[PDB]
Amino acid sequence: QLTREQVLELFHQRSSTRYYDPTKKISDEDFECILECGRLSPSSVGSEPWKFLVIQNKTLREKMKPFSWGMINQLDNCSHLVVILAKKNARYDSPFFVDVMARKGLNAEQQQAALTKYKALQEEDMKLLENDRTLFDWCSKQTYIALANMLTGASALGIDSCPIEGFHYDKMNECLAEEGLFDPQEYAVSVAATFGYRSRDIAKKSRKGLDEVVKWVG
Amino acid sequence: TQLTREQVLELFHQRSSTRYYDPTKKISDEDFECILECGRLSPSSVGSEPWKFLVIQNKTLREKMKPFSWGMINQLDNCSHLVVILAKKNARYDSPFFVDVMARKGLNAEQQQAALTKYKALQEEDMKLLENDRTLFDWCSKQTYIALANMLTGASALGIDSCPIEGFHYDKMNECLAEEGLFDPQEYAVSVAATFGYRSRDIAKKSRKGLDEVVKWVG
Ligand SMILES: Cc1cc2nc3c(=O)[nH]c(=O)nc-3n(C[C@H](O)[C@H](O)[C@H](O)COP(=O)(O)O)c2cc1C
Ligand SMILES: Cc1cc2nc3c(=O)[nH]c(=O)nc-3n(C[C@H](O)[C@H](O)[C@H](O)COP(=O)(O)O)c2cc1C
Ligand SMILES: [Cl-]
Ligand SMILES: [Cl-]
Ligand SMILES: [Cl-]
């Protein structure tokens, strides 16, 4: 439990860190807790379509620099780097969704019902089976939930972070797949995040005002 | 604001998706503004904040949604607050939308030209978002899922229950909300929703994949 003022200050204190102290490393305990915040995240129909690559290998980090302009300095100095993958071809009738149902412990009639629920959602409600990319982006949207909670959970632990889109996705995919780090038919890169301890004061928040981003329908 | 690893874990564990709300309990105006603030303060790619939070308290409007909102059809009645998050359509690097983005960063003329080439690279080449309208909308949509997550977590921290909602016909929803004059359908479309309030059944146990299945370590 937190007060209103603390809840606010938690989201004011979290800022995108572009300069890490290279003399400070996150403890294994603290980082596993950050990862737990991602794994515990909610996801459409319990799909959990994420995978978290923790890239600590200096050599691999250096390989990413030339195509990762968004984090080119952070690559060198951050404690931890997480590249989040999202599941490809996450169709209602896929072995992937066979597992989803197995985790939910559904019997045979419930599974035919769940499947008709997933079919209408993908095909008609959200029109996700348009092409390969729309279905992938649906899973990727769920991984942005994990991303957000990892940033928030880290900040609560006193750990700074930066979410990262600033890299060439085709090359990053090829780089990690060539390392044998995932099956390029099953997964692709969604988004990444650095973690560590900042070296500079937090810059104050610049957002649109509440009255511009909220519309009340009474 | 600081928490032990024990409390952080409990924070993300205590947050569950509630399907059954108690219609007696209503969130205070102070608490719910706090929840909204969690979305508004969320990070977003190049600071684009491409969301809009529609707060649907109108009881008549909530019923009109039920016939195509199977994911929340019971919840529409009993939940305290309902949020439909919109994402910006066609948030191209060269759009008026990105004129505002740059002004909020206080960029000068030289800084704006450099930023514009950075956005163009990001959208056109690094992320390949400009192939069509839907890929570019979906990118903004992804950023709104960050505001979604943080509103759930902030709600949880205040003792307030939530449920994220994709279970509705998007076309019918976009149409319904746009006909009610709630947004410009050329400028925004529905991205995701979320109900807020207090639960009426017990919190359920979490079924997640193992940490060993979802984490791959590269040391
Ligand atoms: C998905 C996404 C990707 C981002 N990619 C980058 C990036 O690659 N490099 C960078 O320095 N910041 C990046 N940012 C951080 C944003 O620029 C930042 O969140 C925004 O300016 C608001 O500032 P704040 O996070 O300090 O509140 C990204 C943010 C998000 C959520
Ligand atoms: C984007 C999103 C959409 C969801 N859509 C629905 C929905 O339509 N109806 C619903 O009751 N739950 C919905 N869920 C809830 C998930 O099924 C639920 O989060 C998951 O099974 C994990 O349980 P937990 O959130 O209680 O940990 C959605 C979740 C998310 C993140
Ligand atoms: Cl950087
Ligand atoms: Cl400092
Ligand atoms: Cl509008």
Residue numbers in the entry:
A (entry chain B): 3 to 220
B (entry chain A): 2 to 220
Give sentences from the paper.
Phylogenetically diverse bacteria can carry out chloramphenicol reduction, but only a single enzyme has been described that efficiently catalyzes this reaction, the NfsB nitroreductase from Haemophilus influenzae strain KW20. We found that expression of H. influenzae and Neisseria spp. nfsB genes, but not Pasteurella multocida nfsB, allows Escherichia coli to resist chloramphenicol by nitroreduction. Mass spectrometric analysis confirmed that purified H. influenzae and N. meningitides NfsB enzymes reduce chloramphenicol to amino-chloramphenicol, while kinetics analyses supported the hypothesis that chloramphenicol reduction is a secondary activity. Previous kinetic studies of nitroreductase catalysis revealed that reactions progress by a double-displacement (ping-pong) mechanism that appears to lack the gating steps necessary to impose specificity, explaining the substrate promiscuity of these enzymes.
Previous work has demonstrated that the NfsB enzyme from H. influenzae strain Rd KW20 (Hi KW20) has the ability to reduce chloramphenicol to amino-chloramphenicol in vitro. We previously demonstrated that expression of the nfsB housekeeping gene from H. influenzae KW20 (Hi KW20) is sufficient to confer clinically relevant levels of chloramphenicol resistance in Es. coli. To understand better how variation in the substrate-binding site mediates activity, we solved the crystal structures of the NfsB homologs from Hi KW20, Hi Int1, Hi 86-028NP, and Nm Z2491. We compared the activity of each NfsB homolog against Hi KW20 NfsB because it was the only previously characterized chloramphenicol reductase. Cell-free supernatants from the empty vector control and Es. coli strain expressing the Pm 70 nfsB gene reactions showed negligible derivatization by the Bratton-Marshall reagent, while supernatants from the Es. coli strains expressing H. influenzae or Neisseria nfsB genes showed robust signal, with the strain expressing the Hi KW20 nfsB showing the highest apparent reduction rate. The relative increase in resistance conferred by H. influenzae or Neisseria nfsB expression ranged from approximately a 16-fold increase (Hi KW20 and Hi 86-028NP) down to an ∼2-fold increase (Hi Int1 and Hi 12). The divergence in chloramphenicol resistance and in vitro activity likely reflect the vagaries of heterologous expression in Es. coli and suggest the presence of important subtleties that still need to be accounted for when estimating mobilization risks of cryptic and proto-resistance genes. This is especially evident with the NfsB enzymes from Hi KW20 and Hi Int1. Intuitively, the Ser68-Met74 pair found in Hi 12 NfsB would provide more of the flexibility needed to properly locate and orient Trp71 to make space for the ribose of NADP than the Pro68-Ile74 pair in other H. influenzae NfsB homologs (Pro68-Ala74 in Nm Z2491 NfsB).
